Amino acid sequence: HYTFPDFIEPSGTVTGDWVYVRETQNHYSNGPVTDVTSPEFRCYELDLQNTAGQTQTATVSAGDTVGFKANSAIYHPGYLDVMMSPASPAANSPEAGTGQTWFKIYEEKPQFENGQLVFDTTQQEVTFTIPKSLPSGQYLLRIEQIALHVASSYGGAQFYIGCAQLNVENGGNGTPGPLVSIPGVYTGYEPGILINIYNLPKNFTGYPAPGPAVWQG
Amino acid sequence: HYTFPDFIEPSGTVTGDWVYVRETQNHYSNGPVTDVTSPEFRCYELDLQNTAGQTQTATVSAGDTVGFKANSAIYHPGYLDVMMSPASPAANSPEAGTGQTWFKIYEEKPQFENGQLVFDTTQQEVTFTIPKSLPSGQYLLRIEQIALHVASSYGGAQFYIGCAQLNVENGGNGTPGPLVSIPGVYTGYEPGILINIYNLPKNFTGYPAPGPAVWQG
Numbered sequence: 069h070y071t072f073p074d075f076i077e078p079s080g081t082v083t084g085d086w087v088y089v090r091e092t093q094n095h096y097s098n099g100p101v102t103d104v105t106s107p108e109f110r111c112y113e114l115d116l117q118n119t120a121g122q123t124q125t126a127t128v129s130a131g132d133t134v135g136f137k138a139n140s141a142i143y144h145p146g147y148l149d150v151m152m153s154p155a156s157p158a159a160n161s162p163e164a165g166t167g168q169t170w171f172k173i174y175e176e177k178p179q180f181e182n183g184q185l186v187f188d189t190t191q192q193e194v195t196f197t198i199p200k201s202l203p204s205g206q207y208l209l210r211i212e213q214i215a216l217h218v219a220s221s222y223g224g225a226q227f228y229i230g231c232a233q234l235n236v237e238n239g240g241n242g243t244p245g246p247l248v249s250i251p252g253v254y255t256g257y258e259p260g261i262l263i264n265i266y267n268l269p270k271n272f273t274g275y276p277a278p279g280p281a282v283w284q285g
Numbered sequence: 286h287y288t289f290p291d292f293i294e295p296s297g298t299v300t301g302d303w304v305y306v307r308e309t310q311n312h313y314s315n316g317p318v319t320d321v322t323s324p325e326f327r328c329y330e331l332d333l334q335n336t337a338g339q340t341q342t343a344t345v346s347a348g349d350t351v352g353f354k355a356n357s358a359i360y361h362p363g364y365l366d367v368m369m370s371p372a373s374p375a376a377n378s379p380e381a382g383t384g385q386t387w388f389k390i391y392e393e394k395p396q397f398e399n400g401q402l403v404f405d406t407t408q409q410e411v412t413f414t415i416p417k418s419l420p421s422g423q424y425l426l427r428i429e430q431i432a433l434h435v436a437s438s439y440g441g442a443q444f445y446i447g448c449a450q451l452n453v454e455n456g457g458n459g460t461p462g463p464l465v466s467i468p469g470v471y472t473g474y475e476p477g478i479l480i481n482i483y484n485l486p487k488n489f490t491g492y493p494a495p496g497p498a499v500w501q502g
């Protein structure tokens with residue numbers, strides 16, 4: 069149970085709560101979204117229609133390292149990913165990211181050792197690189213942790229999400245892919261989402277990361 | 286989130302919901318006790334004063350195999366124990382087991398190998414032997430699973446509890462010990478209760494079972 073209220077800007081400053089990140093519904097409860105088919109799986113805003121317009125947009129350069137800071141240690145075992153979408157008409161529009169335009173730029177997978185998965189549950193700041201070749205333009209940047217501590221049953225996986233609003237400058241001519249929709253990216257039946265992390269399947273050879281591969285940009 | 290509504294009698298019959306097991310407060314929620322100091326940590330009854338009187342008492346013999354069936358798979362990782370107390374004035378008295386009279390008879394313990402804890406989260410029926418040397422008389426039989434999936438913080442451990450009411454016949458001359466009170470047995474600071482199962486401390490040699498040593502009778 070945690071939120072991602074703070075955008076970490078290119079020079080390493082942790083910005084204010086919900087300044088550049090769309091304030092989420094769980095701003096107080098810290099509870100997860102658990103229905104991957106729901107529209108609110110996209111950015112989980114306090115107000116899906118009003119929150120974007122109350123959120124500022126951060127200017128960055130393609131190639132910059134940026135991040136999020138969680139309100140506590142990211143204490144559930146899971147998979148973490150960061151996905152991006154061009155934001156049309158702009159980063160502060162609620163209609164941004166409603167099409168098949170999302171691509172993955174970063175992930176942190178559990179390790180696999182001795183027939184057991186290995187997790188890091190002590191991280192609070194998550195940082196990563198905005199790809200150098202990413203074209204200039206407005207983008208949504210979505211952090212997602214899939215917490216798997218009770219994921220053995222359908223709808224058991226817990227998703228902790230935040231969407232930052234970006235204005236990306238000094239971009240290249242890359243073509244991000246593969247592309248997915250959110251919701252749409254998951255069914256809930258994926259082997260990395262519906263999973264018993266404590267007693268793994270017989271032919272388990274490593275954590276299968278769900279959704280698109282990381283775009284090499 | 287599970288309950289232990291069904292007593293498994295000596296012949297292997299899984300008995301009806303709450304017949305010999307005191308109906309618990311989470312009879313619908315399946316939610317856990319989290320305050321080890323609370324009086325209801327004892328048997329977690331729907332009504333601490335009324336439930337015992339509405340619960341039947343199972344006649345068994347010392348040496349018999351008995352147990353509990355949970356209402357689903359016991360799917361959280363943790364530590365399971367079974368404790369007993371002589372029940373005065375009777376097994377159906379709410380006053381039973383209010384003293385320092387509890388002893389451990391059984392456990393299911395997580396394993397430690399290569400720096401990782403190993404759990405079994407697939408069991409639904411828990412069976413065990415009532416020690417052959419146990420003195421004849423009325424007893425409470427308390428099953429407890431300490432779920433550790435979120436136990437890294439104080440009060441994070443989740444306790445799933447059921448108390449069966451027994452009339453033990455054909456007993457022996459054993460003297461059960463060591464003895465504890467419930468509440469009283471735990472403080473919540475035990476290294477087996479206040480614990481990050483995913484990222485274990487430097488000087489961690491193996492899972493330290495909380496509470497008293499198993500009484501081998």
Ligand SMILES: *[C@H]1O[C@H](CO)[C@@H](O)[C@H](O)[C@@H]1O
Pocket residue numbers: 078079080132
């Ligand atoms: C703060 O530091 C960042 C990261 O090195 C730069 O991108 C930025 O121009 C400023 O100097």
Ligand SMILES: [Cu+2]
Pocket residue numbers: 069070144
């Ligand atoms: Cu949580």
Ligand SMILES: [Cu+2]
Pocket residue numbers: 286287361
């Ligand atoms: Cu539970």
